[PDB]
Design a protein around this ligand. Structure first.
Ligand SMILES: CC(C)=CCC/C(C)=C/CC/C(C)=C/COP(=O)(O)OP(=O)(O)O
Ligand SMILES: CC(C)=CCC/C(C)=C/CC/C(C)=C/COP(=O)(O)OP(=O)(O)O
Ligand SMILES: CC(C)=CCC/C(C)=C/CC/C(C)=C/COP(=O)(O)OP(=O)(O)O
Ligand SMILES: CC(C)=CCC/C(C)=C/CC/C(C)=C/COP(=O)(O)OP(=O)(O)O
Ligand SMILES: [Cl-]
Ligand SMILES: [Cl-]
Ligand SMILES: [Cl-]
Ligand SMILES: [Cl-]
Ligand SMILES: [Cl-]
Ligand SMILES: [Cl-]
Ligand SMILES: [Cl-]
Ligand SMILES: [Cl-]
Lengths: 520, 509
């Protein structure tokens, strides 16, 4: 009574079978990649097959992202009685031998051309995944990447299939799944997904009717309540203070902060980033931007006038973010904006980089202000202007040199730079292709690397816009919502000379809710 | 139902005396109050949902005060001043404390169960002196549970092994006594004019027990396998406490002795086999022990009082040596004092050193063999006491860098010989309370869990996070317990980490 798999040995066969499905799921290993596991070094004592490492239960902890490679290797040098330097060696040689499967990468490229939904489902650890993302170039063929170290789940547990089906909204009826390991294929079949076993010299194809029901939700009821509680919390805050409040102090957690609430920038940030604000709040906060007394001829000052220090200039950051939002909500025309954009091009320093302030007496640069200025440039038609070349290069170097790990002049948190960069790169992809992979690669390395809710939320948002599901940061984010539904205050940006952080519970809650939304 | 209002101290004493276990809260029953910009009423802080987060030990006072500062639209500093005055104006309830003293004196089982935040609890533990009457203290911010959720009552019942039939609960909040009654515990509502006694039929039979059992079995199988293959406990060395890049060393007997002394549920075959390693050890010389095996002994490296102390203490405790054979070595240790009278680390007058934790382990053997009151110990004992009170231990000891290791080994001494160490008990417990969850290393979490339990305090925060760092083979990560300080070499194993983690799981089961 065991279901007899149809064998396949002709590309014509493989092709007709694959065409019968809307959605194809690849696993990386074997199907799309291969490598040499055995690797002898100048260390005679110990194991010789990296397979001993990958078969060890500690490896499950690495794949799920619970531990890193240094940790895994330290525990394995003990369990496997092999000098850890030899295992590190072995693991490196195996990684260096990785190559694509040329046949299946071509299948993958074609499937993507025929406008199919394609997902990558792989047990692979964060550090390896980051390296694979850099080394190969089929990732562009995937509609979504589901990696164990980003999920805290792993094949063959049904949990990972259940999260895949739910996350990607998959109709398992029209879904097939290509993998080498049988137990992964059996698990997916009990979910009603048809399987395609990749063998040495053939494919085993089991069509699966399925159509049975799904089990209990990993945390869905939890999530719906926390989202509602956060929404109620934030809508109440913003309806009472549509001019988004801020607090100041000398630390990122704003411990002991005092209420300031006289800068309009936070309001602009919230208008731009949380895409589910009720309409009355958008309008009420939009009203604030326009009537902001620090508007002078379509240029904005950070401060309200009453709070404006002596001789504090308009800045290209407030102005850029505001104009961009106005433009995008049909409250300003490109014709009115372009003259302001032109003042910005006239604000470059000796190195050609557009500067922060509308004031030649206050020369400053900042990578994120650069980014937000370029965003407005491309949004209005200026994307090919020659005067932007040096500014774009400043931002690219900031990324590639990993200089962003030290923060920007006004934004200390590295993920804030990656986040705003990801809006530019994703929203204007033709003009930013060379950024896409180094950006996605930095983000992969940073999954779950900090505890601050807003930072976790930024990484969730950016990686998802770039096609990668970051469930780990998601989970931890839920754990830090407080009982009233809001998240804790966060110092998004600083007055550098005085080391004054600025932030609000509203800022943290808005990005958190957006991150919960984007993975929903 | 309807309570039976009580106002006779003679009746009350016959109600209470009918019960084997009495649970007190803190508010009103034992502690009460008796006498510009925003919120003048602290009522608003405590009724606010954020306050529940503070009570569960999910956030600390600073976090809570910044969040409330915003939600109550009051300057942070004002909220903090108010919070400090309220706490500072707390006074003992003299009648009820005396009831408590007497219930304790009559050998009842008494537990404290309070919704109080970690920092406040920490203050109250130091301020007031009725804690010595409880058999266990169950504070929400350390349980990550809170009244009146049934969870906490289930935790208390199973944690303390309470027969709810013979258990009565004294609280001033109605809803707490209600939930308590759902578990068959008789309630006694405290009003300032009377008591409301409601008897309840108990005796009829928490919520991670399936998971916890699996992790414990997995960890046991792991450690059992390691020690059966390597009864001479292995060790790795490196520059760092996580022994990243460590190399197999495994030529020192101390780790074996530590395992034996510290993890109580080892199987008999493993205890026997590890005991053989301690007895057949190379470095043994006339019932003094050397850290190293001979094959690894550096030139002129002396026997040391720490390995010797732990080993003799273990053999004694396992009837392999008599006090008569040990006492002459103890006398040698008394002959090892430096100019300040402190007992030194090495059997070698040319390697003069002191180490508060080595002192502790020496003092332990001293009290175990009957030397507890020898005058020559006074300075050593004062060394250790100051080392704690001055907070010098936060800098580590010479050979153990982690502060909690000192607190943990001190807690063996203080709790095993309580009459001789009463003045250590409060400052020790107090320090430990302020260090709950202050570090991530599993072994350090394990030590704080054991020490606090031995001192009558359930630390479940560190417990839960400990369960999360077990690896999938059942063992916990390696950890560097002690160092050669001059080369800054750390020693450690997964056996050490896994042994302590399992004892922590056991002591809270
Ligand atoms: C060379 C090297 C890095 C060795 C260590 C392991 C590793 C990450 C190999 C590269 C390819 C890969 C993703 C294998 C497992 O993933 P899968 O879960 O996609 O494969 P499966 O279905 O074959 O288990
Ligand atoms: C996020 C953002 C709006 C960035 C652009 C600049 C800006 C207006 C920042 C807001 C906060 C602030 C007053 C900074 C100036 O601090 P300083 O006076 O210590 O530094 P400066 O001499 O660099 O102005
Ligand atoms: C100033 C301030 C409010 C500080 C926070 C801690 C606090 C509530 C102190 C007052 C008395 C006390 C220790 C109550 C504990 O709650 P219980 O669980 O002992 O009391 P209940 O049964 O009445 O809740
Ligand atoms: C935990 C314990 C057993 C403590 C007592 C002393 C002892 C034998 C420690 C074991 C580790 C060791 C070899 C230290 C050598 O210290 P060094 O040679 O680096 O410095 P020294 O001059 O302090 O010996
Ligand atoms: Cl790609
Ligand atoms: Cl600058
Ligand atoms: Cl910068
Ligand atoms: Cl574009
Ligand atoms: Cl006390
Ligand atoms: Cl010394
Ligand atoms: Cl010391
Ligand atoms: Cl005693």
């Amino acid at each position: 009574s065991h279901l007899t798999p149809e064998l396949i040995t002709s590309l014509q066969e493989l092709s007709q079978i694959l065409d019968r499905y809307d959605t194809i799921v690849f696993d990386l290993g074997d199907v799309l990649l291969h490598w040499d596991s055995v690797h002898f070094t100048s260390e005679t004592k110990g194991i010789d097959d990296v397979r001993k490492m990958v078969k060890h239960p500690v490896w499950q902890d690495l794949e799920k992202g619970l531990i890193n490679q240094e940790f895994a290797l330290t525990a394995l040098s003990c369990e496997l009685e092999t000098p850890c330097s030899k295992l590190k060696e072995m693991l490196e040689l195996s990684i260096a031998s990785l190559q694509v499967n040329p046949l299946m990468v071509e299948v993958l490229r074609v499937l993507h051309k025929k406008d199919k939904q394609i997902y990558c489902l792989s047990n692979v650890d964060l550090e390896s995944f980051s390296y694979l993302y850099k080394q190969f170039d089929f990732w562009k063929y995937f509609d979504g990447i589901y990696v164990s170290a980003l999920l805290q789940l792993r094949k063959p547990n049904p949990d990972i299939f259940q999260y895949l089906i739910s996350s990607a909204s998959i109709n398992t009826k029209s879904t097939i799944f290509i993998d080498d390991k049988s137990e992964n294929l059996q698990e997916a079949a009990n979910f009603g997904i048809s399987t395609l076993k990749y063998n040495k010299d053939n494919f085993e194809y089991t069509a699966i009717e399925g159509g049975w029901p799904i089990p209990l939700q990993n945390m869905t009821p939890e999530i719906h309540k926390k989202r509602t509680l956060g929404e109620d919390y934030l809508n109440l805050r913003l309806r009472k203070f549509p001019f988004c409040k801020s607090f100041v102090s000398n630390n990122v957690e704003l411990i002991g902060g005092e209420d300031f609430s006289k800068e309009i920038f936070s309001t602009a940030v919230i208008l731009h980033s949380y895409t589910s604000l009720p309409d009355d709040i958008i309008a009420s906060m939009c009203h604030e931007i326009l009537n902001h007394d620090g508007q002078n001829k379509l240029r904005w000052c950070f401060y309200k006038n009453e709070a404006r220090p002596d001789n504090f200039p308009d800045d290209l950051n407030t102005t850029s973010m505001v104009l961009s939002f106005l433009l995008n909500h049909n409250k300003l025309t490109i014709e009115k904006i372009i003259p302001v954009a032109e003042q910005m091009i006239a604000n470059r320093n000796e190195e050609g980089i557009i500067q922060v302030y509308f004031d030649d007496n206050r020369p400053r640069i900042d990578a994120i202000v650069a980014i937000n200025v370029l965003y407005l440039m491309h949004q209005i038609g200026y994307g090919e202007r020659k005067e932007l070349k040096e500014t774009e290069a400043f931002v690219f170097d900031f990324l590639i040199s990993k200089e962003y790990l030290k923060g920007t002049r006004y934004y200390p948190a590295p993920d804030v730079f990656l986040f705003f960069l990801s809006r530019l790169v994703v929203d204007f992809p033709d003009q930013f292709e060379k950024f896409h992979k180094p950006l996605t690669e930095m983000l992969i390395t940073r999954v779950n690397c900090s505890t601050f809710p807003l930072e976790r939320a930024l990484r969730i948002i950016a990686l998802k816009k770039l096609g990668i599901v970051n469930r780990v940061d998601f989970l931890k984010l839920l754990d830090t919502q407080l009982a009233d539904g809001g998240w804790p205050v966060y110092g998004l940006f600083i007055a550098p000379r005085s080391n004054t952080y600025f932030g609000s519970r509203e800022l943290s809650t808005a990005f958190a809710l957006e991150a919960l939304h984007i993975l929903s």
